[PDB]
Amino acid sequence: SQELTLVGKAAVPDVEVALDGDDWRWLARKRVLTLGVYAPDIPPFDVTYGERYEGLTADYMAIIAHNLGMQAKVLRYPTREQALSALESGQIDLIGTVNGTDGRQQSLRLSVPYAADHPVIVMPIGARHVPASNLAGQRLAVDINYLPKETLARAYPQATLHYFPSSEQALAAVAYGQADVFIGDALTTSHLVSQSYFNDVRVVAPAHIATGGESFGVRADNTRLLRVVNAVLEAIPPSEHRSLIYRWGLGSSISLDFAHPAYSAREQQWMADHPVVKVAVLNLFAPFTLFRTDEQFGGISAAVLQLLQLRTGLDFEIIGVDTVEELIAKLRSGEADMAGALFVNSARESFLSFSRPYVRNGMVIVTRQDPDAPVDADHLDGRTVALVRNSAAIPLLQRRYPQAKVVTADNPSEAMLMVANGQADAVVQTQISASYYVNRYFAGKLRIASALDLPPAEIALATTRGQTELMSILNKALYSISNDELASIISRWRGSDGDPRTWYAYRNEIYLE
């Protein structure tokens, strides 16, 4: 048994609480409300530093203590089973961070969940669709602390269970090939994946295992305490439930109230008749559409398409082409049902329909890092400037900067290589794309001279205009995707500027021996 002091957010909200005048005076004499917490310490619920207790459970404990005029105390127990006994004594009035599988005890009763929480199914980036076959033949990794061994076994009997000390270890397994699937807590998964594993795994569906959200547990006879705690929790508005979830960085898990878009008669029967949708993408349009060292589809678009898959349940199959002219070709003929990423273009709006854009970004001209390179975009007079053939930018550019000499290339990658080779003085790119390339691969060879005085580029999904049922389905889904998820996705694709030259250097010395 260890005592801790509760820090849980600076400004704790006031909820409208309605209690029996007899309930209030009971609380008044009780003085101290004691929460008990336990062994592993599983973020974001439980976070321990020094003598201080904090976390999502801490925060609701804070909300309960504050709105009931109570002094909060915290004791921390070496194991979950010792904590359960601490409740019985009852040395402590509340136990923290318990779900549906701990009461499930009958010795203990659960408060209304203070945190919405359900189990989710995680698979590697490549994996397509849920094994709706109830994960048969799969190696299913789980936190030993999350679900009871036989809840899984009953729900996934043809799956091979493999238990790990922690949620992270289970998830690591799926990332690094020791397991095929992960089942885990939605909140903690969201944390783990967003922080640093989003390249390795993805949340693919909810699991058909019922757990309660996260709750406080109160000893079974203590029917009065359950009343007054629930009095508070029920009064917490959803805005506060949400606000706290964003703060612990679990913004990715809001979406996990999963199926959300309401679909038409005409739309969902289309979805039955077209379970697989064919997407055309550019092979070298980084960081928007690309293929990794894995031969795997990747980039901002690949990330968004994956979410669209979560929202619609469609299975996207990706077809990669080298040039833009080819991409449109496959779109017209129906070889491809949709474009993964196209700049919104009024010219092609003749025959194409664009989704709600999911990237809006400004443009820049990239030059070599020679003394002779155009110093900035206002000094483009008589210099050769690379653009992609038939770009919406091309008319606009020679309108704004007429002394600039436009030369065209087939795809965005060749346009940039022209500048790297000496065949051009500048190339027009989105800031995201240019920023990316310059610091990542061309440190000390290329540079962003300046912005262009053009309107911002918009990147979207595209279909042929006839494709009406698809586009309304995509747009419905795209609307369900918040700009926070898009920003999280984009910024983590742009990344940060490190020191690739020191490490090009190390890879090169090693190659000599």
Q: Which of residues 114-143 bind its own copies (CB under 8 A)?
A: none
Q: How many amino acids of this chain bind its own copies (CB under 8 A)?
A: 106
- Extract the runs of DSSP E, i.e. beta strands, from 78-135: 94-98, 108-110, 119-124
Among 237, 334, 382, 466, binds its own copies (CB under 8 A): 237
Q: Does 453 bind its own copies (CB under 8 A)?
A: yes
User: Smallest distance, Å, CB 86 to its own copies?
Assistant: 24
CB of 278 to its own copies, least distance (A): 22
486 binds its own copies (CB under 8 A): yes
Rounded least distance, CB 451 to its own copies, Å: 3
Of 275 and 495, CB closest to its own copies = 495
Question: Per CB under 8 A, does 435 bind its own copies?
Answer: yes
| Per-residue H/E/C for 83-97 | HHHHHHCCCCCEEEE
Handedness of CA 110, 111, 112, 117 (dihedral sign): negative
81, 294, 325, 381: which one binds its own copies (CB under 8 A): 294
Which contacts (CB < 8 Å, 24+ apart) does range 483-489 have? 484/246, 484/251, 485/251, 485/252, 485/255, 485/307, 486/304, 486/358, 486/359, 488/194, 488/251, 488/252, 489/300, 489/303, 489/304
Which span (81-89, 95-103, 203-211, 499-507) binds its own copies, by CB under 8 A?
A: 499-507
Among 126, 137, 148, 165, binds its own copies (CB under 8 A): 165
Nearer to its own copies, 23 or 200 (CB): 200
| Candidate list 19, 112, 284, 394; residue touching its own copies; CB under 8 A | 284
Residue labelled with tokens 């653009």: 387
Tell me which DSSP letter residue 11 carries: S
Footprint of its own copies on 13-72 (CB under 8 A): 13, 16, 43-44, 49, 52, 54
Of 226 and 449, nearer to its own copies (C-beta) is 449
Of all helices (H) and strands (E), which one includes residue 248? none
232: its two tokens: 């508070």
The distance of closest approach from Cβ of residue 276 to its own copies in the complex, given in angstroms and rounded to an integer, is: 25
Q: Is 196 in the site for its own copies (CB under 8 A)?
A: yes
Using the rule CB under 8 A, give the single segment among 214-222, 271-279, 305-313, 434-442 that binds its own copies: 434-442
Mark out the alpha helices in 319-411 (DSSP H runs): 324-333, 393-400
Q: How far is it, in rounded angstroms, from Cα 312 to Cα 256?
A: 13
Helix (H, G, I), strand (E, B) or coil at 241: helix
Q: Which of 178, 230, 323, 472 binds its own copies (CB under 8 A)?
A: 178
Least distance from C-beta 40 to its own copies, angstroms?
A: 10
C-beta of 378: minimal distance to its own copies in Å? 9
CA distance 82 to 38: 8
> 443 near 500, Cβ under 8 Å?
yes
Please say which residue, 277 or 489, places its beta carbon nearer to its own copies: 489
Q: Which residues in 315-332 are b (16+ Cβ under 10 Å) and which e?
A: ebebebbebbebbbebbe
Smallest distance, its own copies to C-beta of residue 224, A: 28
In the window 352-411, what residues touch its own copies (CB under 8 A)?
356-357, 360-362, 364, 376
In residues, how long is the chain? 513
Least Å distance, CB 182 to its own copies, is 12
Q: Where are the beta strands (DSSP E) in 362-414?
A: 363-368, 384-388, 405-409
Is-contact 115 58, C-beta < 8 A?
no
Stretch that binds its own copies, among 111-119, 145-153, 208-216, 280-288 (CB under 8 A): 280-288
10, 18, 132, 512: which one binds its own copies (CB under 8 A): 10
Q: Does 500 bind its own copies (CB under 8 A)?
A: yes
Rounded CA-CA distance 303/358 in Å is 11
Binding mask 197-216 for its own copies (x = CB under 8 A): xxxx----------------
